[PDB]
Write a protein that binds this ligand. Structure first.
Ligand SMILES: *[C@@H]1O[C@H](CO)[C@@H](O)[C@H](O)[C@H]1NC(C)=O
Ligand SMILES: *[C@@H]1O[C@H](CO)[C@@H](O)[C@H](O)[C@H]1NC(C)=O
Lengths: 215, 215, 322, 324, 215, 215
């Protein structure tokens, strides 16, 4: 129903500021309180506050009063959050979510989340290497793609846009990220069929397709 | 502030069993005759989703196997029967008094019948060998339980250096895990040795599962 | 008081000398601070109280509680050096500042200041309204009182009326009434809700008043005044005063509509326009009230006056103020 | 009202928004002036009044009298143009602004104010038939219109009241009454440029419950606020105060060069006497029966007068000037 | 009782200013309103105003508001009046007198009066000539003194300090004053007795005595 | 202002008669049941003195022959019987409203039985003849009525040049007048003629009274 669309990922230098957005479709005046939450990777969520695009009612939590600034545009029905002096403690995922007033409702719908990385590192697009096996074969063959040497996270790896797929968490090496992704399809299909891995890195605005062929 | 403490920190449950999570508040979350308590499910890489709103109300379109109960300080989420989809982290939240506060979270892990890892070995890519570096990759797919140790043999010498491993989240379909083992060397080092071997010791068999290749 | 002032609505600037009643509620930062003239005198009175069987005290005004928060370490330590094993601990503020029936006297034990109610230390054995102002981020110096009474400290109250705009004001109240065809209350702002009586010495139009027509109840420091009146409404005994901080005016709650019908239900405890689950109740009515409807707004949403009921919705599903 | 203020006695400076009650009596220049929105409507109502047997009018406030002075040429000119042989003349102000029993409504002569007269008594004079419309700015204008209902209450848009720091003030275009809490609440100072005959509306009155008219210092019939701030221990209603002064200054202190004592041998309370006889001799020794010192004193353009309960100790009252 | 002493005579140039004084002995705070009056020679009196030395209460008449200035000294119990730009219309006698407030008293006591002459003429002391009669004699002889050529008025002519005396008003001739004074005494006394006329002119601070002797 | 008009401007009354002066105010001088009106007597060269304070109160130490009456606008001063001391000017004054105002005044002249003037003739002084000027003086003492004309004869020629005459105030004792006639010449002019004559024509006799001298 109420559709939330948040801004894209951000890479910001230390001490600077970032302003992210959240557009809310399907809203009404009486609900439509955009709440904002800060989550480090696999840690507890922090509540920052809320703003109503139509009411301009805003509330901040004590921990973020000096840190965050909430603004709103009625016609766009959009909420904006800005983060003052930025530190490594601020590198995290910021979630936009529909809520209500104090003793009112729950967090009904959520945006997809904006990833913020606070560093002096410079956006580097990844290298994509295919992974194929002259050896033994069975009624199933597995293929892979290695995404190496990119910053910042993350990338999205899709196989033919639609089989069993496995996506592996990226790891840090020498200040850049390396991850991999593997898919399993029947060997009667490969390499008779064609199979392509698509790696998307938005922060460098790069998309790389790799066709899988045998060694 | 009202501090929500969740128990247990992490939980492992078998298919079809009953799962019970508890949330303990430092102060009463009850006002106007209602309990301002909520339960959310978060799949990884995804926004959280509501299951129980208030103490004991099923969210619209949520399977009736979920249920909530409790009052004042103590609350309980029950899943019966827990199924393969429910591998996710579960949070409790209160909105009785500012600031809104969350629990630390409960990571739910599924128990299934043990399974052997499908091992696959992959030489460095042709594009990689030309750029000045070489990484040999081993994919261990669809095994259970999660604990496992891998062993790289180069020409009969064990290898313990520059090995990076990443575990995936438990798959929502078959409730198994996967892992990527990456051997990173310089380009020249790869060509000094001819035979490469990947060995996995798992709960399934005492004798390791081996996969190897030569140039 | 001498100086100059510009009125936005009246469109004029005036200088001279007289009396200036300021709005000490809608201030962005703390204009006033409570302090004791002699913390050792306070420690003496607290000792003396505990001997009499007094387990704690309840603050009258919010600034008194904030002062207790700032002051409690030294009270506990002056108690510690005089080696009386009595620890003072102060909590936060509930909704209404409930009154206690004991009082101080001028000159493993525990002493609870504010916090929530408890049967182990009830209001029957809590001190209340034992401070008065001595003299003067402006400071305010406090000393021990002389007589036990139920009246708010008159040194803090103020009233004013000019250009047919009337104000009863306080450190925590601000009540505006206005002459639009008739005299009636128009706005009310509360940071606190106390249980003392507004002294008529500081009250405009305090003759020929029925307490049953006072909008703000007399028992909640409501001024006994015909400015404390709205046609079609009677005393708001069961208003959402447990909110502690709120904003009463006369307008429609956002997204709702009130109609006047005799089929409506009788006046009862105040209901809020949002259910506990977040649904909005749109259609409301009142039997004999006058629009705009009496509304409160607090930290959890919009509430309606006692005579404003749901038109179609059943009252059992709605949040009420009891 | 938004702005800043300095308190000399309190020794502080305060800014912000709220309500500012100004002392419109001790102002150095005329801050406010009365003007009618429609002089022609006034001429029409005066036609109607004179026809009905109303021979004149008496002003309630002094500014109304000054307005009639400013307006009379144009009133007579609009009257002459409208074909009616009626001449309007407005006079000066006595002490009290005496009230009339008639009112206006929304050769021959027409007397406005001036001294008393038997040809045109107060029974046939219009009184309190104007109320405030709106305000001018910059001085300041006050626009007047004809009142829809006739009553004995002073126009409420001119009144003001305030209390703070346990100092209370009831104020007006012509009054300024200060009361204070010193051990008890009592009236302390009062300043008058006018003395009117209307009633002070209780809507603009602090502490207006449980008040005895017989205890009001400033009498109710002289626009005295019905208030317990209008008390002073040991004194009763000053019905026969020197209100004929028109402009005066009441406080609680000794008249220059005199001394009051409290005895039972003193005379009973009567009309107010002045400390200087008609010939200019000073009566030094005074007393009161059961009043409380400092003594209630008035000061006016012709000297110092005492409260009703203060009599001469030794001198015979016949040689002294009294206010009757 | 209440004794009033005014300053001496004054001769002032046109357009300049003069400040005269009045000391009041026997006064009290509550009376003692020094009123000031302007009287041209044999004309109606004008009321200027009054001042109270102790109260500093002052009141001016409208005709003199720009012209006169009243000041007071408490310790001296003295009133001072100053006359701004001076013109020929101001040459007159200024009287200081005790009075009271508006409907209070009469002019009980009066000072002696200060004579002010506003002119460019320069103070000139007089010449005193005796006047005696070898002729017929009777039981009474009259003698005289001529005071000629002085400015400004006036002079005081006393005969032995204490008989019938006649004092003649001064007349203006060529811009100076000429007056005479005659006394009648029994001729059995003169010239056997000695008789002296004493002429005092304060504005020049001159006194001239002339003894009467026969031609 | 309240304007006091006095009638008559000047009055002549015989010894022992009744004198009546009237004071007419332009506005009522009555207040508090009293008439704020006063009557003052001014001897020449002297401050005024109070006779009647208020309408009809005798001033302390004033002879009871004075009396005052009247009210509102009209007031009357009566002297009965007027005596030789009362030759003076009489003023009325009001202090009912500011400014305090006076009447124009009434000059009282005493009528007595007519008397002949004592004539005395005086040559220029020895001190005067040496300083460059010469003045011949004639004294006319103790005559009545006031009107009189003098005639100077120098060597039998009438002289009409440089003659100045001054009249005194009516004497308080005998109610008579006096006059000084002064002939002013240069020194040399006096010596060109030898005989000097002073001639007075009065109501007493048709033939003039003459007094003369020679060098
Ligand atoms: C005054 O009352 C009229 C009539 O009820 C109303 O239309 C107007 O809005 C009111 N103005 C106010 C409350 O300022
Ligand atoms: C208060 O009353 C006392 C009584 O003696 C007096 O001395 C003092 O001046 C009064 N103070 C004020 C401010 O009125």
């Amino acid at each position: 129903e109420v559709q939330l669309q948040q801004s894209g990922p951000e890479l910001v230098k230390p001490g600077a500021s970032v302003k992210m957005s959240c557009k809310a479709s399907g809203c009404t005046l009486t609900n439509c309180f955009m709440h904002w939450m800060k989550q480090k990777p696999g840690q507890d969520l922090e509540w920052i506050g809320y703003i109503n695009p139509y009411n301009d009612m805003t509330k901040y939590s004590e921990n973020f009063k000096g840190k965050a600034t909430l603004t709103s545009d009625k016609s766009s029905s959009t909420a904006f959050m800005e983060l003052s002096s930025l530190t490594s403690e601020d590198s995290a995922v910021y979630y936009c979510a529909r809520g209500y007033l104090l003793r009112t409702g729950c967090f009904d719908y959520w945006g997809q989340g904006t990833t913020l990385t606070v560093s002096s590192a410079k956006t580097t697009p990844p290298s994509v290497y295919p992974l194929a096996p002259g050896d033994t074969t069975g009624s199933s063959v597995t293929l892979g793609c290695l995404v190496k040497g990119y910053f910042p996270e993350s990338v999205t790896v899709t196989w033919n846009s639609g089989s069993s797929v496995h996506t592996f968490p990226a790891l840090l090496q020498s200040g850049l990220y390396t991850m991999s992704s593997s898919v399993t399809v029947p060997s009667s299909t490969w390499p008779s069929q064609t199979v392509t891995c698509s790696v998307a890195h938005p922060a460098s605005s790069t998309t790389v397709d790799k066709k899988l062929e045998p060694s | 502030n009202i501090v929500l403490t969740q128990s247990p920190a992490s939980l492992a449950v078998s298919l079809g069993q009953r799962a019970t999570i508890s949330c303990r508040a430092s102060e009463s979350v009850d006002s106007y005759g209602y309990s301002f308590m909520h339960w959310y499910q978060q799949k990884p890489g995804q926004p959280p989703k509501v299951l129980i709103y208030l103490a004991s109300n099923l969210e619209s379109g949520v399977p009736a196997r979920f249920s909530g109960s409790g009052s004042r300080t103590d609350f309980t989420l029950t899943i019966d029967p827990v199924e393969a989809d429910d591998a996710a982290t579960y949070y409790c939240q209160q909105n009785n008094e500012n600031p809104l506060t969350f629990g630390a979270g409960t990571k739910l892990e599924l128990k299934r019948a043990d399974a052997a890892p499908t091992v696959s070995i992959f030489p460095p890519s042709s594009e990689q060998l030309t750029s000045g570096g070489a990484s040999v990759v081993c994919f261990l797919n669809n095994f259970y339980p999660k604990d496992i140790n891998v062993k790289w043999k180069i020409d009969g010498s064990e290898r313990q250096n520059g090995v990076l491993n990443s575990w995936t989240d438990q798959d929502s379909k078959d409730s198994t895990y996967s892992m990527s083992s990456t051997l990173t060397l310089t380009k020249d080092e790869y060509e000094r040795h001819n035979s490469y071997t990947c060995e996995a010791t798992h709960k399934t068999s005492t004798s390791p599962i081996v996969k190897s290749f030569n140039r | 008081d001498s100086g100059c002032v510009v009125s936005w609505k009246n469109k004029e600037l005036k200088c001279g000398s007289g009396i200036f009643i300021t709005d000490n509620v809608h201030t962005w930062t703390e204009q006033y601070k409570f302090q004791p003239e002699s913390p050792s005198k306070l420690a003496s009175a607290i000792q003396k109280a505990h001997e009499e069987g007094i387990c704690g005290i309840r603050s009258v005004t919010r600034l008194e509680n904030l002062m207790w928060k700032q002051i409690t370490p030294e009270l506990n330590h002056i108690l510690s050096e005089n080696e009386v094993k009595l620890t003072i601990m102060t909590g936060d503020i509930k909704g209404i500042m409930q009154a206690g029936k004991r009082s101080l006297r001028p000159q493993n034990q525990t002493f609870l200041i504010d916090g929530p109610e408890t049967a182990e230390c009830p209001n029957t054995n809590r001190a209340w309204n034992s401070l008065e102002v001595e003299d003067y981020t402006t400071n305010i110096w406090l000393k021990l009182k002389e007589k036990q009474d139920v009246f708010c400290d008159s040194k803090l109250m103020s009233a004013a009326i000019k250009d047919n705009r009337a104000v009863h004001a306080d450190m925590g109240y601000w009540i505006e009434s206005a002459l639009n065809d008739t005299w009636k209350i128009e706005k009310a702002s509360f940071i606190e809700v106390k249980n003392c009586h507004w002294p008529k010495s500081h009250t405009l139009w305090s003759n020929g008043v029925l307490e049953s027509e006072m909008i703000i109840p007399k028992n909640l420091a409501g001024p006994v005044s015909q400015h404390n009146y709205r046609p079609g409404y009677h005393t708001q005994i069961t208003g959402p005063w447990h909110l502690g901080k709120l904003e009463m005016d006369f307008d429609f709650c956002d997204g709702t509509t009130v109609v006047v019908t005799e089929d409506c239900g009788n006046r009862g405890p105040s209901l809020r326009t949002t259910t506990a689950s977040g649904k909005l109740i749109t259609e409301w009515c009142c039997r004999s009230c006058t629009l705009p409807p009496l509304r409160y707004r607090g930290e959890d949403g919009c509430w309606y006056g006692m005579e404003i009921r749901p038109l179609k919705e059943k009252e059992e599903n709605l949040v009420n103020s009891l």
